[PDB]
């Protein structure tokens, strides 16, 4: 809970909160059952009204079209859209992106790493189970996490990842404020 490292993470979360649009790439390793059966995605996101369109790997089927429209999270199988979940129902079920950052322990500045041609500050930390459950409802312990924060003046959250017991989730941002067509 180093105040300087926490401050730097808050800078990236505030930058994230201020985005009009962003491209998100989700990747996983091992076994992750907490993303409604999705294990990979590349998704264009519009922040307000929240809307998303892209592609995902769902139940091991690749190239599955993916959308968020209104309250619905949906995937297209063959010619048919089906709803995997509801935003409101997940929001009450699991419990904006300012998690209780106090609660985050053992912040460590690991130095500089280049991701997609961007120099980033790598900071590791430990996330309390209560916050981990928001991502993985079955989580029973505090888990290690990592964030990579651009050093270019933007404070972009270029990447964030969490090592869950059974697997890991990695989220990579790009295309900040580049226009998207999501409907
Ligand atoms: C090592 C310390 C870990 C601290 C916790 C890191 C939190 C990671 C948050 C994930 C990044 C957000 C997902 C990308 C989608 C961005 C769309 C913008 C809408 C969010 C606006 C809002 O929060 O109200
Ligand atoms: C890309 C894979 C999608 C799987 C997502 C399922 C779990 C997500 C983790 C917590 C969900 C937070 C719900 C969002 C809060 C409401 C946002 C809003 O209404 O603007
Ligand atoms: C420290 C945490 C690192 C893992 C990041 C979480 C990964 C995946 C869940 C977050 C949702 C990604 C955004 C996808 C579009 C937003 C609409 C939605 O699916 O809820
Ligand atoms: O919404 C999606 O991502 C898929 C849709 O069928 C398209 O326009 O290709
Ligand atoms: Zn310090
Ligand atoms: Zn992509
Ligand atoms: Zn995109
Ligand atoms: Zn059909
Ligand atoms: Zn789980
Ligand atoms: Zn930006």
């Amino acid at each position: 809970s180093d105040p300087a490292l926490l401050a730097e993470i808050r800078q990236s979360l505030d930058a994230t909160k201020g985005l009009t649009s962003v491209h998100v790439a989700v990747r996983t390793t091992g076994k992750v059952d907490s993303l409604l059966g999705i294990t990979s995605a590349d998704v264009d996101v519009r922040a307000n009204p929240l809307a998303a369109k892209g592609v995902c790997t769902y139940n091991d089927e690749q190239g599955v079209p993916f959308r968020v429209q209104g309250d619905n999270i949906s995937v297209k199988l063959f010619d048919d859209w089906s709803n995997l979940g509801s935003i409101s129902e997940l929001s009450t079920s699991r419990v904006g992106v300012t998690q209780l950052l106090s609660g985050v322990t053992n912040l460590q500045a690991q130095g500089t790493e280049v991701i997609d041609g961007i120099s980033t500050t790598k900071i590791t930390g430990t996330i309390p189970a209560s916050s981990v459950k928001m991502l993985d409802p079955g989580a029973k312990s505090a888990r290690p996490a990592t964030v990579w924060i651009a050093q270019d003046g933007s404070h972009h959250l270029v990447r964030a990842s969490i090592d869950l017991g059974s697997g890991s989730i990695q989220l990579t941002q790009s295309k900040w404020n580049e226009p998207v067509n999501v409907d």
Side-chain angles (χ1 to χ4, degrees):
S1 43
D2 178 301
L5 303 182
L6 245 196
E8 184 66 358
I9 298 165
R10 276 178 164 113
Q11 291 275 352
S12 71
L13 294 184
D14 289 341
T16 302
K17 278 194 179 184
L19 293 168
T20 309
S21 63
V22 66
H23 181 94
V24 171
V26 179
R27 300 290 179 273
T28 59
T29 68
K31 289 182 167 302
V32 171
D33 292 317
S34 62
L35 305 179
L36 310 176
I38 296 176
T39 57
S40 184
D42 283 79
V43 183
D44 286 339
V45 180
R46 185 190 66 204
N48 249 283
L50 184 66
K53 187 179 172 185
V55 68
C56 72
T57 296
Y58 168 75
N59 287 357
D60 289 318
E61 180 77 357
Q62 298 187 256
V64 173
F66 170 94
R67 69 190 186 190
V68 172
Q69 290 189 347
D71 187 56
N72 299 319
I73 297 165
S74 300
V75 295
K76 191 183 184 180
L77 298 171
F78 210 77
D79 62 330
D80 305 298
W81 286 99
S82 61
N83 296 323
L84 298 184
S86 148
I87 290 168
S88 58
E89 295 191 315
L90 291 169
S91 194
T92 334
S93 169
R94 336 248 291 202
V95 186
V97 299
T98 270
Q99 57 171 67
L100 292 208
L101 261 174
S102 186
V104 176
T105 51
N106 200 7
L107 289 178
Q108 284 173 40
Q110 305 287 181
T112 295
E113 182 179 324
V114 183
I115 295 168
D116 295 326
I118 303 159
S119 299
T120 68
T121 302
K122 183 188 182 183
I123 303 176
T124 55
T126 292
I127 299 183
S130 63
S131 288
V132 179
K133 287 178 197 174
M134 290 174 45
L135 218 36
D136 175 30
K140 296 294 195 302
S141 67
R143 300 304 309 167
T146 310
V147 298
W148 288 264
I149 299 163
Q151 298 168 348
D152 54 17
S154 68
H155 290 104
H156 285 143
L157 185 59
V158 179
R159 183 170 288 172
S161 78
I162 186 169
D163 166 28
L164 310 162
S166 58
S168 63
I169 305 171
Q170 178 190 85
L171 191 144
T172 303
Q173 296 180 14
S174 58
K175 307 192 82 76
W176 301 274
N177 293 329
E178 297 177 24
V180 297
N181 177 30
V182 292
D183 41 50

